[PDB]
Each structure stands twice: as C-alpha cells, then as structure tokens.
C-alpha cells in the first residue's frame, strides 16, 4: 500500500451543460452579477421550458412506440420487440437470430437510450449531452454493430418524433435540430485525444479524450489583443488580477497598478510580461510571499502563474533551489520563462486554472491541487506538496491512524487538538488494521512491553512519572485506634493519592463544587478500591462535559486512553474496539472497557493510580528538543575538550 495520502476532496465533474448552468457559470467566472445578457438567456429559456416539457412528456409516453417502429424497420427476420429491455446510404437489414441475443439486447437498449438522451437534451435546452456522448461513439460501436443501420435508425426516429408531435414550426424545429445534431455527431468519427505533454523529464505525459473536455465547463480564456475596446480590455485586466491575487482586488480595496495597466492596454508589454511584473510587484509580495513560508509561497506561485500545482518531487526541489538563490523575482522569472507557460498561455492569453475538466490530470498530486485551487488555499500555511512528495518515498509516519489531527499535544492537562478548519494541516496516511505505532516508554527502554511484555507492571525508577499507590493503611481500617487518635499520621498520604487520582483523570486539579465527595469518602473508608475510584471519576458528568462532549468522538477516545492508561493507542485494532462500544453502548461503557481491560490491570493494580507510561515520538520531541532540557549528546558530535600539550 501507499505510505502517504494527499487527501480525497470531493470532485464534481460536469457530465453535461444546461442553459442555466451555462448562464450562471459565465458570470461566476467573471465575478459579476448576471447582467442584461445572462438574464435574457434564462428569460427565453424559462418561457420555452414550458413547451420543452410538452416535447418530453409526449416522447416519454410514446417511447415504446418509437423504438418499436425503429427496430421493425432496421431488423428483419422475426420480431425484435420479443425481448424488450428517409435517406439510406446502403444499409442491409440485420437478421435477429444471426446477430445473437446478447448483441440484440445491446442494440435495443441503445435505441431507447438514444431517444432518452434526446428527451434530456430538450429539457436541458443544450445539445451538450448529445455532443459528448455521441462524438466518440462511431468507432467503439463499429466493431460489432453496423454504422449504416444506425444512421437510418436515428433518421427513422427523427421522422417518428416529427409525425407524432407536429404542433408548431416554433416547436417541432427544436426536435428536428437536436436529432440533426445527434446524427451529425454520430456520423463524425472519434476526434484525437488531448495530449498533455510533460514540460520536463520529471513530469509524466497525459492524455484526455475529446469528450471529457466537451461538458466539463470550459474555463473562460482572455487574450489581450491591442485593438480591443477598453471595456473588454478592462475585463482582461480584471481577470488577470483574479488569477494572480485569487480575487478582484481592484474592486475590493482599489489596489491596482495603473502604471502596468497602461502599458498592456497599449501593447508595450505582453500579458506574459504583465504577469511577470505583477508577481514581482510589492502588491503580490505582501499578500502571497510575505505571510507564507518559502515552500508554500512557491506552491501558491505555481497556481497563480502556471495555473497548476507542482507535479513532481523533483519539480519542488528544483524551484525551491531557485527561490533560495534569487528569491521571489528569480522564482517568478523561472515560472514565466518556462517551456510550459509559453505553450499554454503564450504571450497574450491570461493564465487560467487548469483542473479536473480543463485537461488530463495526473494521479500524484490530486488532493494537493484540489485544496490549492480552492480560495481557502492561502490560509493553509503548512506546505502540502513537498510534505506529501517526501512522505511518498518514506514509510508510514509517526501519526495516529485517523490522521495527525487525532493526536493531542502531550501536555499535563487540556485536550488540545489541531483543527481541520483553522489552519489546514491535515496529513492523511493509509494506515491498515494491524499497524502498531512505536511508542517511547517513560521509564527504562528495556521495560517496554513491545519487547518485554512481562515488565508491564514495572514502576519507572526516576526515569518516568511518579507512581501513586495505596500501600499505607487507610485511616479507620482497624479498631486499634479507638475513638480518639486525632493525630493519625496515615491521612495525608491517602489525600495526596486522591488529588493525584483527580489529576490523572482530569489533568488539572478541580474546583470546590466539582470534587465527587461521595466517591472520595468511600475510598477513604475502604469501601471501594482505587480502580473503582478512577472509574467513578471518569464516569463523572464533569468528565463527559469537559473532554468527551466538546471533542470529536475518536479524539475523545484517544485522549481518554492517554489519561486512563497513560498510553496512546497502538493502532486501528484498539481504536475500532472502543469506537464500536461508543456507538452501541455509550461513553460510560467506553470508560468501563478501558478500566476493565487486561492491560490496565497488568500495569496498575487495585491500589495503583494510573500514570503516563508511553509517549508519542512527536510528543517527546516537544519536551526534549527545546533550547533547555536537550542534552549535548542527542544529535551533536561531542569533542573531548582537553588542555593542549603546550599548556
């Protein structure tokens, strides 16, 4: 399996274009309200739509009759309708028995599905659904189906739909032209596939059929020609600002460089030269270079100029070396004066975001580019490309099975988790079921249960956390100290145990009206053991309110396991177990399961208060990789400082 995941954000491909879709998206890409044009697109469609309902309603009802009259004309030698699911060029009627039942079932359903897609075409009001699904169909159907028989079948249906309807010339012509498009697209052979050639050796070459880029909403492409009237020239410049700055900033804040605008309006500098000068401008520098790391600003510079994310590990490595050498100008210069930029946009065309629909996509930087094309990209300040690309070659990282966000910070108190929304730093990794996470023991390294399972109930001797035990006799256990004995020495020890037992369940010491006084005195009397006392504090409504309720279910399970057992979960096997209990039984039973677990009983007895036994490598790094606490012999060469021989 793969060791890294870039993310799997929802992809929404446009299967076919409708009139409302074509109208709305036209102004959406331009970042405008629907003007007198785009409103009139809808107005004429909504008026005709009532008639377009009557087209389909007749054709949906009489669908059985159209396909029956078609199949009878085409297929000879029996009845084709036994197993229902004008210009002849030179067709020969196909025998029913000779063609075979399996081929006949295909033939019949396609004839119905051709008419079905015609009815959808009128209702949509755009023959896009036809153009896509009919263009590259002649070639694939040629193998085991005659083309000559299909043309006359559609032409029969054209006449069949004409005679059955026949209302008005303003009504029937919609039926006629859509059928006329249908036969013309079917007569047309399969066009050449769109070949996305790799710009260098590092990036793979791709191919996309001439059907996928026929529906998936074409990105509006603006080119600065010197003769254009200044209204559409303004539309080009606004689009150029919408590409570089992700949004129209000249409308928002009136932030515009008129010095550069004037030169492009004339034709002194090209759009290639404009993008160059605009991306090295202090206006871009402040917004997409200054707030970001060198790696992330590089990743943003890719989508602004080239209109795509970095494709390969080698590409990020190359372009980071450029931005380290000469900075932002040198990076911009490398991006504009590339073989890719001049191939896609040339000199005149404004850069555009080439995503799922525009071109063929590679299976490498899918989710990394999906989040990048979003407007929420310049808030993810953690790089997504260089992180995933490096993690691809490496094995599985030190991470919780349900992501990096599921890992809490290894602190004394407070369940603090990285938020998915606030500062996107989600790092998915394909963890399987039987994947045990390597955990660092607080005590001796030999006392790890992975290598030494017998030494699970061994106390950390001044290496890890302090162990609290009810070793000493509880006050008022035996009737030796009769009535009096005001100075019973064994009283402060059990109270310190209670406080520590509170400190383990809830990281911090609680307030006055939060302490369970009933549970405390039962432990002090010797009615319940520590195991029962820890269980009661974790079964408290306060623990539910503070740690369980405000947090994500599996985050709350993970933190509870780090508090009750003092250990992060090894992997899926344990996490799925408690998550199954959380679904069926509830929170209280999850508490019960973690206490009544065998590993709890082995590590901590009936008198032992739980403690931090194991840390995550990331957690220990936070503790012992700071300026202090770090030893000299961790990751540094130690030279023996000896007095010189001349001294």
């Amino acid at each position: 399996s793969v060791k890294a995941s870039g993310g799997s954000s929802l992809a929404r491909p446009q299967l076919y274009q409708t009139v409302p879709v074509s109208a709305i998206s036209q102004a959406e890409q331009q970042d405008r309200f629907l003007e007198g044009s785009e409103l009139n697109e809808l107005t004429a469609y909504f008026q005709s739509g009532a008639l377009r309902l009557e087209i389909a309603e007749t054709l949906t009802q009489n669908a059985d009759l159209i396909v029956s009259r078609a199949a009878n004309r085409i297929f000879t030698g029996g009845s084709p309708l036994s197993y229902l699911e004008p210009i002849p060029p030179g067709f020969r009627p196909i025998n029913i028995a000779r063609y075979g039942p399996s081929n006949m079932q295909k033939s019949l359903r396609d004839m119905s599905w051709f008419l079905r897609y015609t009815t959808y075409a009128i209702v949509a009001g755009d023959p896009n659904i036809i153009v896509v699904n009919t263009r590259g169909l002649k070639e694939v159907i040629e193998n085991a189906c005659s083309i000559d028989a299909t043309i006359v079948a559609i032409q029969e249906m054209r006449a069949a739909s004409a005679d059955y309807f026949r209302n008005n010339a303003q009504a029937k012509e919609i039926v006629l032209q859509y059928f006329d498009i249908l036969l013309s697209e079917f007569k047309a052979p399969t066009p050449a596939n769109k070949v996305r050639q790799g710009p260098s050796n590092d990036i793979q070459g791709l191919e996309l059929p001439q059907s996928y880029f026929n529906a998936a909403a074409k990105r509006q492409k603006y080119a600065m020609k010197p003769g254009l009237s200044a209204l559409e020239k303004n539309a080009v410049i606004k689009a150029a600002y919408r590409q570089i700055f992700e949004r129209d900033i000249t409308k928002a804040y009136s932030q515009s460089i008129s010095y550069l605008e004037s030169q492009v309006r004339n034709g002194d500098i090209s759009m290639k030269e404009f993008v160059r000068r605009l991306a090295k401008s202090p206006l871009y520098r402040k917004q997409f270079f200054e707030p970001f790391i060198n790696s992330r600003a590089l990743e943003l510079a890719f989508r602004h100029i080239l209109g795509r994310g970095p494709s390969s590990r080698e590409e990020v490595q190359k372009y980071f070396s450029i931005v380290s050498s000469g900075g932002l100008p040198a990076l911009v210069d490398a991006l504009v004066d590339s073989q890719e930029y001049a191939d896609y946009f040339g000199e005149e065309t404004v850069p555009y975001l080439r995503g799922l629909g525009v071109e063929a996509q590679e299976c490498r930087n899918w989710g990394m580019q999906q989040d990048l094309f979003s407007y929420s990209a310049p808030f993810r300040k953690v790089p997504q490309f260089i992180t995933t690309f490096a993690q691809y070659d490496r094995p599985l990282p030190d991470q919780h099975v349900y992501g990096s966000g599921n890992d809490p910070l290894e602190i004394q108190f407070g369940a603090i988790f990285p938020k998915e929304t606030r500062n996107p730093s989600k790092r998915p990794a394909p963890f399987n079921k039987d994947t045990k996470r390597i955990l660092i023991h607080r005590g001796p390294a030999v006392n790890n249960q992975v290598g030494n399972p017998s030494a699970v109930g061994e106390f950390p001797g001044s290496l890890g956390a302090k162990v609290f035990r009810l070793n000493g006799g509880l006050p008022g256990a035996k009737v030796g100290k009769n009535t009096g004995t005001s100075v019973k020495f064994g009283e402060s020890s059990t109270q310190a145990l209670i406080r520590a037992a509170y400190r383990q369940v809830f990281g911090r010491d609680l307030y006055e009206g939060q302490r369970l006084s009933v549970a405390e005195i039962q432990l002090e009397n010797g009615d319940i053991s520590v195991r029962e006392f820890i269980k009661r504090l974790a079964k408290s409504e306060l623990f539910l309110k503070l740690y369980w309720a405000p947090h994500y279910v599996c985050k709350a399970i993970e933190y509870m396991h780090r508090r009750l057992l003092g250990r992060p979960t090894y992997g899926r096997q344990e996490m799925n177990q408690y998550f199954d209990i959380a679904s069926k039984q509830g929170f209280y039973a999850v508490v019960e399961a973690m206490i009544d677990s065998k590993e709890y009983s082995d590590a901590f007895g009936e008198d032992t208060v739980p403690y931090e036994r194991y840390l995550t490598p990331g957690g220990l790094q936070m503790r012992s990789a700071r300026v202090g606490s770090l030893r000299e012999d961790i990751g540094q060469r130690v030279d023996k400082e000896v007095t010189p021989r001349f001294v």
Binding site: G90, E139, A192
Partner: protein
Amino acid sequence: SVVSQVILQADDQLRYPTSGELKGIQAFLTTGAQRIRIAETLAENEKKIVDQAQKQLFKKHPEYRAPGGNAYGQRQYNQCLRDYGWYLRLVTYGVLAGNKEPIETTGLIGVKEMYNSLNVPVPGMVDAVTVLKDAALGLLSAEDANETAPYFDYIIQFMS
C-alpha cells in the same frame, strides 16, 4: 534521428551529451550499414508490397469499394495506394534515421483529424498499416524483419 534526440535532451538540461548518450550514438552509427539495406529492399520492391497490402485490405474491409464507401472513383482508389506508398516511404525514413521522429512530424502528428476531414476511417486505416506490416516483413529476412517491425507498430499505436 537518434542523433537529434540526444542533442535535444542535452540542450534541454543545458549541457553536453553524456557518456551513455554518446554510446547510444556510437551503437547506431555502427549498425548504419544494415539501415541502408532496409531502404533498397522496400523502395524497389514497392509495387509488390503495395498491391498485396491493398488486396488484403479491401477483402477484409469490403465497404469502401462497396456503395456508400470512401474510395469509389478510380481517382480516389489511386489515392488509397498513394497513401500506402507514402507510409512505406515514411517507414524507410524512420528506420534510416533510427527513431520515430521522421514518421512523427510528417505522417503521425495530427493524423486523426486529417482523415476525419476526409471521411476516411482511422479504425479503417489502423487495419491498413497491419496488412502493410504483414506484407513487408514477409518479403524481408528473419533478422531484418525484427528491426523493421516496431516502427510499423508505433504507427498502429498512434492511429488507434
């Protein structure tokens, strides 16, 4: 040529041709005596190859000669043998240079929309190359055929 492909790849990285790149040239220049031999046996023996290729095509595809076809006229039928003669000409250019580039630039780059605008089927011409391949390699000797084989196969790939 493979000579051009090396110096393109070297210029792309802005460097001189490498040790393995120069040896790739060295290997081609030695086997150039065989490359010359490919040309003569196909150019002079064109009339036998072209006639065998066309008779096998129109037998397997009796549609273009049939009513409502593509090549019904005698001037149209000569154009089908013209293409056959041009493709085998392109094969010779490819082998001699050593790579697909001569075939690529002349008769592969944008070849689908070529015959789309002439109503000639590309799935019909993908079967035309195969019978031309079968006729050519049959006349060629055993060790000579295996050299000329993958050049024909690339044309098949780009068609359909």
